[PDB]
A paper describes a structure:
The plug helix is also flanked on one side by a specific electrostatic interaction between E111 and R157 linking neighbouring strands within the barrel lumen. Two further conserved charged residues that engage in an interstrand salt bridge within the barrel lumen (E111 and R157) were also shown to contribute to FapC secretion: while the E111A mutant displays secretion activity, the R157A is secretion deficient. Intriguingly, although R157A crystallises under the same condition as the wild type, we found the symmetry of the trimer was disrupted. The structure was solved at 3.2 Å. Despite the more limited resolution, it is clear that the helix plug remains in position. However, in a single monomer of each trimer there is a conformational rearrangement of side chains due to the void generated from removal of the large R157 side chain. The side chain of F103 is observed to shift, and extra density is observed that may be attributed to a detergent molecule binding in this region. While detergent binding is not necessarily relevant for the in vivo activity of FapF, these data together with simulations imply that each pore of the trimer can function independently.
Author numbering:
A (entry chain A): 88 to 120, 145 to 179, 193 to 244, 253 to 350, 352 to 376, 378 to 406
B (entry chain B): 89 to 105, 107 to 121, 145 to 179, 192 to 245, 254 to 406
C (entry chain C): 88 to 120, 146 to 179, 196 to 243, 254 to 296, 301, 303 to 350, 352 to 406
C-alpha cells in the first residue's frame, strides 16, 4: 500500500492507521481582517490497538497579535484547549463498501477564557480557548474509486453549560453569570488523488455552523447577538512523503466573514 | 465514455444522453445583513436528434435574512421566476472545430417582485424574483485537447420595461411607476477532466456585469439608482458522478470573489435521463 | 522536450529556458471593492545559455475608480530585470534562480494628488531594487515550485487648501509563494499556487519629523489557478485567475499573456 495512498487515507479518514504509534507537529498561520495575525503550534500523539481502535491527545499552543487610529494587543505562546479523541473504524473498504470511522472528541477549557476580559477601546488580553467543555461526535467516509479518492465528514459539537466568576467586559463590574455556548454542526467533503508513489493532492470544502450563544447574568437568558456563525472553507493540500516522516501542507481560503481570510497549515506526521 | 458525456451535458447546457428531468438543491450564503438562501429547481427537457433542445425550469425559494439587537425576515417555499429555454447546437466537435451551442433563455416574472415591499422601520418581506421579463441569448463552446476539455460561455440579458402599482419602499406611501432593470453581460471559461469511466472534475471562472437600474415614478422623470449596477464574480469547483448511468449526481462549489456575489454556493443536481 | 514542461517552467521560474530573444505581451483586468484596473504589459527579454536572462517591462495602465474618476491609458513604472540561474536541476538539485529587478518611477506619482480626487496615480513614484530566489523541481508528475523576495524602496523628496513638501519612505516588502503544477498533455499545463505580499509601514516627513501612516501596512494574500497552452511553435497563451484572499488584494484578477520566443 504505497505511501501516497496511505498518507492520503490517514489525512482524510482522521485515523492515523499506517503504523502502531504516531506523533505529529503542526504549525498553522491564520490571517483575520481589526487586523489580526495568529500562529498555532499543535502537538499530537496517537496509539493503535487491534488495527481498529485509535486514541490520541492534542495540545495546542497559541501566539496571537490583534491590532485595533490604531493600537496593538498580544498573547504570548500559551495553551490551548487540550482535546482527546477516541476513534473506531466500523467499516473496512470493499468494492461495495467505503471506509468508515465514528469518533468522539472531548475538549477541555484549558486555554485562557474569553469572559471577564476588561477594555482599557482595546482588550487587556486575548483568549486562547472558548472556556467550556465540548463533546463532538463525528463520522467520516473515504472510498477509492481509482484514481479519485472521494471522502467526506459530518460532526456535531454540543458545548456543556458552565458558570463564571466575572462576565462583564466593563472595567467596573464583577457581574457573574453562566453561559450556554450554542451548538455547532460541521460538514465537509472533497476528493484526493495519489499523484505518484510519494505524493498525493486534495481539493475539499467544509462549512461550520454555530447556533447562537445564550447568556445569564446573576437576570434571565439574554442571548448574545452577532454570536451565531457560518464558516466556509476551501482547501487545497498535499501529502508529501519524506522518510515514517511526512509533510502535509494545506491552504484554507476563507469563504465567510466569520472564517479567517486564509490559513496555511504545515503538519509533520511521524509514525513509530 | 459516460463521464465524457456527463462533462459535456454540464459544460454545454446541451443534454446529449431524449427526455431529461433534473432536481436541483442549492444553498447560498450572503453576509454583507446576513442571509441564508435555499433554492430548489425542477427542470424538464426534450432533446431532438442531438440538435434541438427545449426545456423548462421551476425554481422554489426558501429565504432567511437578518438585519445591541437585530430582527429577522423569512420567506416560506414560494416559487421563483419560471423560464423556458431553446438551444440549437450548430457545430459538431471535429479535429478542426469546437462543439458550439446557441440559445435563448426567456424568463417570466412569476416570483414575488422586490418593488413595493415597504421597509417596516428591516423589510416586510423578501422577494423571489425581479418582477420583469427577460430574454437572454447565449453561446457556449466546448473542445477536447485530450485529457483537458476546454470550455467557454457568453451571454447577454435584456430586461423588458414593466409597470408596477407601487415602486415605493415607504410604508406610508404608494407611488406607482415603471422600471428598466439595467441589462447584463455574462462571460466565463474553464477546464474539465474525465477522472475515470464514471467521474469528471471541473475548474471554472465567471463574471456577470450589470448596467444600472432606473425607476420612473408618476408623473416624474427617469432616475437611475446609485450602487444598483454590479459585477458578480465567481470561482467554481465541481464534479460529475454517474450514479446509475442514467442518474447523474452533479456537485458544485462556487466561491464568490466580489461583494456583489454570494460568499459561497453549494449545488447538487440529479439529472435523470430516461 | 516537451513543449508543455517547457512553458510550465517558464512561468513558474520566470526564466526563458529554450529561446534566445523573447517578447511577451499581456493584458490584465482587476476588480476592487469600486475600481476597475486594466494593465497592458509589454515585456522584452534576452537569455544567454540557460544561465543569464535580461528583460525590459513597460506597464501601460487604464483605470476607473468609481466613487467617478478616470485615468486614460498612460505609462506605469517601467522596470528591468537581471536574472541568473545558479543551479540546474538534476535528480538531486532544483532549477534555482536568483533575480534582481530595478523598478524606476516612470509612472505618475500618487503623492501630489489633492482630495473624488483630481486624478488617479499609475505608479508608487520612487525607485526600488528588488532581489529574489526561485525553485522548481519535478517529482514526476508533480512540478513543485516557489518564490521569495524582499523589496527595498528608495527615499525621495516632493492633501488642497495648503501645499507642504518633503521626504517620503515607502514600506519595504517581503513576498513569497508556493505551488504545484502539472503537464497535462504535449501542448498544455495547469497550475495552482499561493502567495502572500507583506508590505511594511510607510514614514513621511514634512519640511518636521518622521510620522508613520497608520494603515499603509498591508498583507495581500492571493490564490491562483493558471494554464499554459501552446499555440504556434513559439507562442504560448497564458491565462491566470488570481482570487484575492485578504482585503488588500483585489477581489479578483484575470491575466492573459502571450509570450513569443523570437
Ligand atoms: C473539538 C474538536 C474539534 C472538531 C474536529 C472534528 C473533526 C472530526 O472529523 C473526522 C475526520 O478528521 C480528519 C482529520 O482529523 C485528524 C485528527 O486526528 C489525528 C489522528 O492522526
Ligand atoms: C511548502 O512545501 C511544499 C513543497 O514541498 C517541498 C518539499 O519537497 C520534497 C519532495 O520530495 C520528497
Ligand atoms: C521604454 C523603456 C526602454 C528602456 C530600455 C533600456 C535598458 C537599459 O538599462 C536600464 C537601466
Ligand atoms: C520556539 C519554532 C512560531 C511563531 C512564529 C512567529 C512569527 C514572527 N512574529 C513576529 C509574528 O512573532
Ligand atoms: C457555470 C456556468 C457554466 C455553464 C454554462 N451554460 C450556459 C452551459 O449553462
Ligand atoms: C520576478 C519576480 C520574482 C518571482 C518569480 N516569478 C516568476 C514567480 O515571478
Amino acid at each position: 500500500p504505497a505511501q501516497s495512498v496511505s498518507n492520503l487515507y490517514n489525512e482524510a479518514s482522521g485515523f492515523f492507521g499506517n503504523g502502531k504509534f504516531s506523533f505529529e507537529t503542526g504549525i498553522t498561520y491564520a490571517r483575520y481582517d481589526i487586523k489580526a495575525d495568529n500562529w498555532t503550534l499543535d502537538l499530537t500523539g496517537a496509539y493503535n490497538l487491534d488495527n481498529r481502535w485509535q486514541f490520541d491527545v492534542n495540545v495546542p499552543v497559541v501566539y496571537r497579535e490583534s491590532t485595533y487610529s490604531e493600537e496593538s494587543v498580544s498573547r504570548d505562546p500559551t495553551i490551548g484547549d487540550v482535546n482527546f479523541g477516541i476513534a473506531y473504524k466500523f467499516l473496512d473498504e470493499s468494492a461495495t463498501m467505503p471506509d468508515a470511522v465514528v469518533s468522539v472528541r472531548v475538549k477541555a477549557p484549558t486555554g485562557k477564557e474569553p469572559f471577564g476580559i476588561k477594555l482599557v477601546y482595546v482588550p487587556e488580553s486575548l483568549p486562547t480557548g472558548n472556556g467550556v467543555w465540548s463533546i463532538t461526535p463525528g463520522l467520516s467516509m473515504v472510498k477509492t474509486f481509482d484514481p479519485a479518492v472521494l471522502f467526506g465528514s459530518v460532526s456535531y459539537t454540543h458545548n456543556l453549560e458552565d458558570s463564571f466568576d466575572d462576565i462583564s467586559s466593563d472595567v467596573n463590574q464583577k457581574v457573574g453569570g453562566k453561559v450556554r455556548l450554542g451548538d455547532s454542526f460541521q460538514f465537509g467533503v472533497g476528493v484526493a488523488f495519489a499523484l505518484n508513489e510519494r505524493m498525493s493532492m486534495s481539493f475539499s470544502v467544509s462549512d461550520l455552523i454555530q447556533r447562537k450563544s445564550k447568556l445569564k447574568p446573576d437576570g434571565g437568558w439574554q442571548s448574545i447577538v452577532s454570536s451565531d456563525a457560518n464558516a466556509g472553507y476551501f482547501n487545497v493540500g498535499m501529502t508529501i512523503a519524506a522518510s515514517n516522516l511526512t509533510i502535509v501542507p494545506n491552504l484554507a481560503i476563507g469563504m465567510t466573514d466569520d472564517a479567517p481570510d486564509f490559513t496555511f497549515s504545515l503538519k509533520f506526521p511521524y509514525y513509530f
